[PDB]
């Protein structure tokens, strides 16, 4: 809800400091590592 | 939800009389009619076909 | 819930005026534009 | 949430003891009797009919 019970306006929500930086810098270096872990897996799968 | 504020068991929740039959009388015939409507639509998309 | 604790039936819920047309006329002219952004994409990818 | 309205820490939640063993054991045979009933079924659909 927007307003509180009395009628006042709720406080500004706290956005995470440097949010998208933390997001796009833990999804990108773990999306690449998610690729490199697969390349050297299939290329190892055809051996055995 | 098992017991109320004061430890008294909640009343037995009311079921639907002929519950598992009211549903089959509305899911079975409309499951069939679900087929019959496509048949007589694709089939009647040939004789009266324009484009 | 239909009624409040006192038994008073809740007020009428408000509907958006022409609320069906105000969405069925924002998806149509934005579904077609969904093609041009793709029809000119493949014609660039060829 | 985490603290009651008074400000006290909520009591420790209770983890069903041996929760994972209780859970793997009910989903290994059930998954396994899953294949075993599909193997012995396709062999009955194509030959005996």
């Amino acid at each position: 809800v927007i307003v509180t019970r009395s009628g006042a306006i709720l406080p500004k929500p706290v956005k995470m400091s440097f949010g998208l930086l933390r997001v796009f810098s833990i999804v990108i270096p773990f999306l690449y590592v998610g690729t490199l872990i697969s390349k050297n897996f299939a290329a190892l799968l055809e051996e055995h | 939800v098992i017991v109320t504020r004061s430890g008294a068991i909640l009343p037995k929740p009311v079921k639907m009389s002929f519950g598992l039959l009211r549903v089959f009388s509305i899911v079975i015939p409309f499951l069939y009619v679900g087929t019959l409507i496509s048949k007589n639509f694709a089939a009647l998309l040939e004789e009266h076909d324009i484009f | 819930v239909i009624v409040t604790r006192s038994g008073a039936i809740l007020p009428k819920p408000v509907k958006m005026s022409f609320g069906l047309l105000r969405v069925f006329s924002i998806v149509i002219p934005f579904l077609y534009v969904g093609t041009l952004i793709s029809k000119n994409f493949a014609a660039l990818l060829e | 949430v985490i603290v009651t309205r008074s400000g006290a820490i909520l009591p420790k939640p209770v983890k069903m003891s041996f929760g994972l063993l209780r859970v793997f054991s009910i989903v290994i045979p059930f998954l396994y009797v899953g294949t075993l009933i599909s193997k012995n079924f396709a062999a009955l659909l194509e030959e005996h009919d």
């Binding site: - | 694709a42 998309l45 040939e46 076909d49 484009f51 | 493949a42 060829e46 | -």
Partner: protein, 352 residues
């Protein structure tokens, strides 16, 4: 016809041009022989093969993607497909090989053979004919779109089919295949496929009506009904609307067509040499560059759908562009996404 006759044929094309060749094989394949102690392989009669190439051809109504005629003959003895399998039944490992040979320039085999060529030049034994076959396959469209799927059995870890390994390398599996008789084998194929595609028109007395030949010429394009109706007008103008064409008549035009990389030069010259293109022009050039004699009737129907709209002036840049894509059948396309071959292509030139 708004039914599973057009909405399916237009699905056939989208499966003939973007789906993995494993799906293309087991869709068009109809026979599934199990004449074994319990094994099961899936073949395709030679007629299905040519259907697996030409667009706008509908699979029989019932034997679709996994409806097969289970067995427990097909191609003529002289037909090339008899050297395959048992009678004419193409296996999978052969169909994928049989389609690298159909759509590969003759130069590539001249080079592939003459580069591995263990001792000499032009001859290769079997184990050298697996690298060569695998290399040329690793460049064609159906070669980079084929990850082996053992789940459905359609794998390609088998050697050559071995009903033709002997046709190539003798019974002892020791003969060195010269490059000369191979490029003869390939021509024996492309002429055999062109026959099957021809018989798939119901030739009355070995004659194919003029309109059915036009459709046979433009089949590897989009929709061009307006063009076949254009020549439909000239059917009354030239009065040859009841003559038709024979198989030897059409075949010459496709032997002429194999030299399109030069007829493009010839026609462009005549265009800028101050000469108007007509029957007497192309009739002559077919004799001087391709050395093959074309009949007037073939040179009648070509201008009937390729001229400047009713004047016999063959529109070169329209003619060569279509014949370029019909000579090599519709299997030179990338048959895949255009992203990676563009993104990495953008990196290399945009950086400078």
């Amino acid at each position: 016809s708004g039914f599973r006759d057009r909405k399916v044929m237009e699905y056939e094309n989208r499966i003939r041009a973007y789906s993995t060749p494993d799906k293309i094989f087991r869709y068009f394949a109809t026979l599934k022989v199990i004449s074994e102690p319990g094994e099961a392989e899936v073949f395709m009669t030679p007629e299905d093969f040519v259907r697996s190439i030409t667009p706008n051809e509908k699979q029989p109504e019932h034997l679709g993607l996994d409806q097969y005629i289970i067995k427990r003959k097909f191609a003529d003895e002289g037909s090339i497909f008899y050297t395959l399998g048992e009678c004419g039944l193409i296996s999978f490992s052969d169909y994928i090989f049989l389609t690298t040979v159909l759509s590969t320039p003759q130069r590539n085999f001249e080079i592939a053979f003459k580069m591995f060529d263990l001792n000499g030049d032009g001859e290769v034994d079997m184990e050298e004919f697996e690298q060569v076959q695998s290399i040329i396959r690793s460049q064609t469209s159906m070669g980079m779109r084929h990850r082996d799927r053992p789940t459905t059995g359609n794998t390609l870890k088998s050697g050559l089919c071995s009903a033709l390994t002997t046709y190539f390398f003798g019974a002892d599996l020791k003969g060195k295949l010269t490059i000369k008789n191979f490029l003869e084998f390939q021509r024996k194929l492309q002429h055999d496929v062109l026959k099957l595609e021809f018989e798939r028109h119901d030739p009355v007395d070995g004659r194919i009506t003029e309109r059915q030949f036009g459709g046979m010429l433009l089949a590897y394009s989009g929709v061009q009904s307006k063009k076949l109706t254009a020549m439909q007008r000239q059917l009354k103008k030239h009065f040859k609307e009841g003559k038709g064409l024979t198989f030897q008549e059409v075949e010459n035009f496709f032997t002429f067509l194999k030299n399109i990389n030069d007829v493009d030069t010839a026609l462009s010259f005549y265009h800028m040499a101050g000469a108007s293109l007509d029957k007497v022009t192309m009739q002559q050039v077919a004799r001087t560059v391709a050395k093959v004699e074309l009949s007037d009737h073939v040179c009648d129907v070509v201008f009937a759908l390729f001229d400047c709209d009713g004047n016999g002036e063959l529109s070169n840049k329209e003619f060569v562009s279509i014949m370029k894509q019909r000579l090599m059948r519709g299997l030179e396309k990338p048959k895949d996404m255009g992203f990676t071959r563009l993104m990495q292509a953008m990196w290399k030139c945009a950086q400078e």
